[PDB]
């Protein structure tokens, strides 16, 4: 399984990795990705191509090293990165700046397309605060920061469209779109918060948390086809699954990592698969597809074994399309869990998955790429 | 150590000290800050030129090289792999494993040099810096490979010369370049360097490749063909040692002597007298020192000349004799105005079997402890160091690993590797790790959480407290009170939690609302860290109960916060004002007894205000707003008391 | 090869001191021009003046950073007989006052009767304490009881040295087995005064600093002194800048249980004496590990000193300004 990833040493730590979005009408595989750096004397955003040199040999091991196409200097650490579209990359900075870069494919260059230099700052001191996470729904951009603020931008608007001041009294670590006008945020006090961006107030619509001791939540992702299903990762390395319609508590809590979980992502086109990365140097693939064997109604077979776990579930919810991630049946939810990287990397800070391709970035100053995720 | 009678290497700093200005300096964790100072104001010039430049002198530029960053990460993986494996293998299996570990280090050096070479061709302005780094890495790999042969493989007489021929071949490539150019010619036998290619292959012990070139000459020259056949036969018959033969060194020496007598007989018979180049090759096969020195330019180095001399005069050389031949080869090869280079001293010390002198010379020549730290660690696993503690309580291995790891801690991305090096330092590693962990620049919460995990795994409770206190203070400076409070609670700093709690109460008095509600609501058992944090959390629980319309429970909690004296005296007005909406409700919420307790708390505060007021501050506008608030409170308390007495009296029938 | 870098300090007169912050990303400079300047290191490794202000009514002799746990705090001392404490207010000063305004003078310590020649924050495990030494032959130790209110500083201790004080060094040892210690140097030019370095130890029973030792071999004027950081040594190391560089080891003798209130006696050895400056030595500074000493002198050089594994100290480098 170690033979699935091409490793590229790049001589700087990688904070973020994202695939360039492909057209849904193209049979084209993603061949271009972007990376952000952190904790370097000069931080940068880089664009990379995976090499396709035409191995018409079904039997040669893939040694296609990623090639840097171009780069641009980034003020402070790249705290988060997303593609807004095929040509535009959005970044959150440790300086509190949100920046849109444009990639010019014709000359392989990056340029600043737009910038908000005071997106994040502490009220009263006007001191800059880190922009910790960003999410894109073209042309809309949302950012969150250590100042506990939520900012809404449009890529063509020079001004911030809306700020939610004092949205949190704590650091927000992650943000995702629940819907076109609803976002989820995660914070340093172990809360998942739902926001309606059209609501004129600064209060969240809903607040979710674990029972008992609360640990920081670092990452959040939303199931692509099932908007009510959310995954989060936190400081204790735990994977939490939520139904944001059903209660304020997680539906499942899974031991995923031995240290801080940095990213969680559902597979965009095959959401029976989920991926997580951690400070412990691991990259996990979670497979929930084992229950997709259509119930072939046949035949009977007895046997008993007891193991105790407490769940109080009332016995009347219709068999509507059980999300594999919400299955509570210990006889049916066989999650297959695979570590994708060899043992002993430094921190795996970021992952992204598109089609058959996965990229991740590490504190080992290395990028890992596979193009045969499920082979 | 006698104090080094070596003048300290002067580092000239361009532009510093122009104009009789005094130099100020400040030591950083691995950098020296330098700035110009005017140390003596004799004269009121308000136009004294601002110090326009601050210089940062870095001792280790190599730590910042993107390519050497790969060297440090791959070498760390090899190092940690070696330390974990130290318990598992005995005898011959261990030696083969240590040679494999040595080869893994050399493979990383070679891969870094190949990458630097490809980068140097692409970029003209940085090419010179890559060329100097490639030269240093080549000298490291050269000397490491020699140390692998002499110390780790401990090569005996016989195999030793085979490994030294392979060593020269891996590090001296000029003969192959000459032969490639000769072979690209339309007529290789008419090429000026043709015989240099033949002679160069013979000097390297490459008899088969020399014979392939001679076969071309035998095809072209009908007159030379008889002599080429004799020389081809001499080269073909040359005895070679093989690393798996049943042949004794004595049986080899006898065959080698007989072959040498065959070469000498052909020379004495004048067999080659019509071709000076074939005669020269035959004199090289006899180990003729004059002809070997005439071919200096093909060998380029005294250690290639050494190995050529060993091949043709001393093919059964013992390890104990190598230094004598090395010294003699250096002296003969350098017998003009050329001084030995620092690399020559290193290689001579290696041939002397003086590991301490090899380490010392590399510690002087190298900017970076990488070579000496990893070579010494690998040689310590060979049991070549006696357990002599230096006068400072560490052994030489631990000393070099501590300084190397300290070097890695200076760099913003490599400090994590330095942690694992300190864990394999048994005497001082833990104390060095504590000291360096407290000095890490915490620029981001992500970096602080990584440092905390490392400290928590190693039970470093003081460093965990120090890091959390630093992050709490940084968050406080950034006006993030909730983040500051969370970090103060994690530090278990009750005094700092009190100071942050007083700022939340002050911000509430100024704004009427809390900025970070969700964190205060989730304090749980951490609320008990200080009386002021206890008050803040319970006062927030009151506002939550009030928002949930639980007015009786909220009223009882608010009263308990005043009577328990956990509220700061400055905040008692605000608490009494927050009781006003509950006192004015249509339903009696406060009992007659509870209303008397509230009246007592109001009067206790009015008494305290009369005692704190020295007579001269009665005249600034804040006194009237407070008095109106107190009159409203007295009226609300009297109205609640009158209702409470009527309702309680009506329930006692 | 050490690369010297000139920084245009733009001071109008002689610079007396340079102090780095705990992270080595900022430096403070002080001058005869009565000013302190702060300089920030950019990502490209360049130095930029980020603040410059007049602090004192005379030459500023020393500047020191507090430990970052107490925030961004500077102390300066002067010929005007005062020490001043400054706090950096990190906040959104609206983007028009980037020139001078984020450093606020919190206090001025005025108890000294003559020039305050040196000023040093204590090790963080002792709290927010500031020692000052004056040419009046007194060391004064102040404490800020509240880190949130740096305007208040209480005089905790007064130490009479009976010699003109030129420099001070806290013993940075966090070992609870060692009472807090201060070394004090004297620039007194009198040849009849032997012992121009005095060591004071805090005596818990008396709640006072008591004179533990006097380095009788140091008869020449002392320009600077530095205790080496103690990373697990059972002994202290003290550097002394005078006509030469001196390095002393101080091994605490086990308190015989019979002296129910004595100062710790030390077995003191001179482990190095270096005349290689051929001139007066003005400054001495240890690396963070206490293993390499830097010294500067009238020869216009900075010299680096290190012990080998046999405790033999040697000059390992010489840096010269162009």
UniProtKB/TrEMBL annotation, chain A:
Transmembrane segments: none annotated. The keyword Nucleus applies. It is found in: Nucleus. SMART domains: WD40 (SM00320). Its main location: nucleus. WD repeats lie at residues 210-252, 254-296. One of its GO terms (cellular component) is nuclear pore outer ring. It holds the Pfam family WD40. The keyword Repressor does not apply. Keywords: Nucleus, Repeat, WD repeat. This is MGC154553 protein. It comes from Xenopus laevis. The lineage of its organism: Eukaryota, Metazoa, Chordata, Craniata, Vertebrata.
């Amino acid at each position: 399984m170690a033979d699935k990833f091409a490793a590229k040493f790049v001589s700087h730590k990688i904070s973020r990795t994202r695939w360039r979005p492909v057209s849904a009408s193209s049979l084209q595989q993603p061949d271009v990705f972007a990376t952000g750096s952190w904790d370097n004397e000069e931080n940068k955003v880089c664009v990379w191509a995976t090499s396709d040199f035409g191995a018409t040999s079904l039997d040669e091991e893939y040694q296609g090293d990623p090639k840097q196409l171009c780069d641009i200097k980034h003020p402070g650490d790249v705290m988060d990165m997303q593609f807004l579209d095929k040509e535009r990359i959005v970044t959150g900075s440790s300086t509190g700046t949100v920046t849109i870069f444009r990639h010019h494919e014709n000359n392989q260059t990056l340029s600043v397309n737009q910038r908000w230099e005071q997106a994040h700052y502490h009220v009263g001191s006007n001191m800059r605060a880190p922009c910790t996470a960003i999410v894109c729904s073209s042309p809309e951009i949302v950012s969150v920061g250590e100042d506990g603020r939520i900012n809404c931008f449009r890529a063509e608007s020079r001004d911030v469209l809306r700020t939610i001041d004092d949205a949190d009294s704590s650091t927000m670590h992650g943000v995702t779109f629940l819907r076109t006008t609803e976002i989820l945020t995660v914070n340093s006090v172990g809360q998942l918060k739902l926001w309606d961006l059209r609501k004129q107030g600064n209060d969240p619509t809903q607040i979710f948390s674990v029972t008992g001791e609360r640990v920081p939540l670092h990452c959040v992702d939303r199931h692509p086809n099932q908007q009510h299903v959310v995954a989060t990762g936190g400081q204790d390395g735990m994977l939490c699954i939520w139904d944001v319609r059903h209660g304020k508590m997680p539906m499942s809590l899974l031991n995923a990592h031995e240290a801080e979980m940095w990213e969680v992502h559902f597979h965009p086109s095959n959401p029976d698969h989920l991926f997580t990365c951690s400070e412990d140097g691991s990259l996990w693939h979670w497979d929930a597809s084992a229950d997709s064997e259509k119930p072939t109604f046949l035949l009977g077979g007895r046997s008993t074994f007891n193991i105790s776990r407490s769940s109080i579930a009332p016995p009347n919810a219709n068999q509507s399309l059980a999300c594999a991630w919400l299955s509570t049946d210990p006889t049916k939810g066989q999650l297959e869990i695979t570590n994708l990287l060899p043992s002993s990397t430094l921190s795996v800070n970021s992952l992204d998955v598109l089609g058959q391709n996965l990229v991740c970035g590490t504190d080992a100053e290395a990028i890992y790429v596979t193009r045969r995720l499920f082979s | 150590m006698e104090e080094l009678d070596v003048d300290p290497a002067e580092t000239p700093i361009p532009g510093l000290g122009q104009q009789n200005r005094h130099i100020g300096f400040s030591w950083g964790p691995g950098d020296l800050l330098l700035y110009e100072t005017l140390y003596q104001k004799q004269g009121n010039s308000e136009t004294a030129a601002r110090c326009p430049f601050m210089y940062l002198v870095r001792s280790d530029e190599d730590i910042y090289s993107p390519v050497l960053r790969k060297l440090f990460n791959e070498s760390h993986s090899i190092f940690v792999g070696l330390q974990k494996s130290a318990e598992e293998a005995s005898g011959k299996s261990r030696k083969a494993q240590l040679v494999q570990v040595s080869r893994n280090y050399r493979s990383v050096l070679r891969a870094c040099m190949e990458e630097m070479h490809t980068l140097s061709e692409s970029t003209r302005e940085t090419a010179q810096k890559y060329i100097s780094q490639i030269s240093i890495l080549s000298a490291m790999e050269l000397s490491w490979n020699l140390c692998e042969i002499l110390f780790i493989e401990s090569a005996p007489a016989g195999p030793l010369l085979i490994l030294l021929l392979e060593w020269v071949r891996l590090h001296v490539c000029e003969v192959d370049n000459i032969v490639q150019d000769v072979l690209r010619s339309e007529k290789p036998t008419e090429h000026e360097k043709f015989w240099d290619g033949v002679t160069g292959y013979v000097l390297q012990g490459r008899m088969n490749e020399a014979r392939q070139l001679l076969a071309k000459e035998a095809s072209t020259s009908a007159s030379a063909r008889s002599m080429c056949r004799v020389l081809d036969d001499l080269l073909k018959k040359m005895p070679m040692l093989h690393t798996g033969g049943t042949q004794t060194l004595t049986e080899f020496e006898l065959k080698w002597q007989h072959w040498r007598e065959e070469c000498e007989r052909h020379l004495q018979n004048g067999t080659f007298s019509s071709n000076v180049h074939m005669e020269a090759v035959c004199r090289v096969l006899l180990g003729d020192e004059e002809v070997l020195l005439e071919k200096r330019d093909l060998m380029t180095t005294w250690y290639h000349f050494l190995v050529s001399r060993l091949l043709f005069k001393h093919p059964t050389v013992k390890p104990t004799e190598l230094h004598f031949y090395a010294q003699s080869s250096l002296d003969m090869f350098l017998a003009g105005d050329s001084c030995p280079e620092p690399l020559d001293n290193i290689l001579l010390a290696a041939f002397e079997f003086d590991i301490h002198q090899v380490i010392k010379e590399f510690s002087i020549v190298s900017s970076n402890w990488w070579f000496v730290a990893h070579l010494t660690d690998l040689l310590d696993h060979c049991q070549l160091f006696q357990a002599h503690n230096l006068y400072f309580g560490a052994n030489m291995r631990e000393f070099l690993l501590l300084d190397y790891a300290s070097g890695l801690f200076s760099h913003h991305s490599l400090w994590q590797l330095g942690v694992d090096y300190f864990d394999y330092c048994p005497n001082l590693g833990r104390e060095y790790l504590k000291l360096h962990m407290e000095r890490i620049p915490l620029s981001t919460e992500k970096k602080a959480l990584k440092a905390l995990r490392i400290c928590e795994q190693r039970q470093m409770t003081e460093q965990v407290r120090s890091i959390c206190k630093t992050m709490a203070m940084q968050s406080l400076c950034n006006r993030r009170l909730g983040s500051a409070l969370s970090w103060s609670i994690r530090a278990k700093d009750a005094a700092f939690a009190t100071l942050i709690s007083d700022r939340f109460l002050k911000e509430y008095c100024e704004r009427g609302n809390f900025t970070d509600l969700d964190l205060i609501d989730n304090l749980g058992s951490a609320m008990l860290l200080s009386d002021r944090l206890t008050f803040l959390g319970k006062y927030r629980e009151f506002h939550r109960m009030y928002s949930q319309e639980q007015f009786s429970e909220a009223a009882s909690l608010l009263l308990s916060l005043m009577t328990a004296r956990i509220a700061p005296c400055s905040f008692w007005l605000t608490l009494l004002l927050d009781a006003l909406p509950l006192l004015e409700q249509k339903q009696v919420i406060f009992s007659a007894e509870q209303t008397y307790e509230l009246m007592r708390c109001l009067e206790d505060r009015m008494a305290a205000k009369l005692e704190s007021t020295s007579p001269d501050e009665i005249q600034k506008q804040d006194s009237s707003i407070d008095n109106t608030k107190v009159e409203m409170l007295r009226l609300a308390l009297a109205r609640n008391l009158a209702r409470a007495i009527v309702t309680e009296g009506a329930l006692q029938e | 090869m050490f690369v010297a870098r000139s920084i245009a300090a733009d001071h109008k007169d002689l610079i007396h001191d340079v102090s780095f912050d705990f992270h080595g990303r900022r430096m403070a400079t002080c001058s005869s021009d009565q000013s302190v300047k702060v300089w920030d290191k950019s990502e490209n490794g360049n130095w930029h003046c980020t603040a410059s202000w007049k602090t004192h009514s005379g030459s500023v002799w020393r500047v020191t950073w507090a430990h970052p746990e107490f925030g961004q705090v500077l102390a300066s001392c002067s010929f005007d007989r005062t020490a001043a404490v400054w706090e950096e207010i990190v906040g959104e000063s609206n983007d028009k006052l980037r020139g001078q305004s984020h450093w606020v003078k919190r206090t001025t310590l005025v108890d000294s009767r003559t020039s305050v020649t040196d000023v040093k924050f204590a090790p963080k495990h002792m709290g927010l304490m500031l020692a000052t030494c004056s040419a009046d032959g007194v060391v004064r130790i102040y404490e800020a009881p509240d880190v949130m209110n740096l305007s208040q500083w209480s005089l905790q201790h007064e130490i009479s040295c009976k010699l003109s004080c030129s420099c001070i060094s806290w013993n940075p040892s966090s070992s609870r087995a060692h009472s807090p210690m201060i070394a004090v140097g004297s620039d007194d030019s009198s040849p009849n005064i032997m012992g121009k370095v005095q060591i004071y130890e805090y005596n818990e029973n008396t709640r006072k600093y008591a004179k533990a030792e006097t380095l009788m071999s140091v008869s020449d004027p002392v320009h600077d002194i530095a205790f080496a950081p103690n990373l697990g040594r059972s002994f202290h190391i003290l550097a002394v800048a005078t006509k030469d560089v001196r390095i002393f080891t101080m091994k605490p003798l086990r308190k015989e249980l019979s002296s129910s209130g004595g100062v710790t006696k030390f077995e003191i050895h001179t482990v190095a004496q270096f005349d290689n400056h051929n001139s007066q030595v003005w400054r001495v500074s240890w690396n963070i590990t206490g293993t390499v000493l830097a010294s500067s002198g009238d020869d216009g050089t900075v010299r680096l000193w290190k012990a080998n594994y046999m405790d033999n100290w040697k000059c390992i480098g010489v840096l010269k300004g162009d």
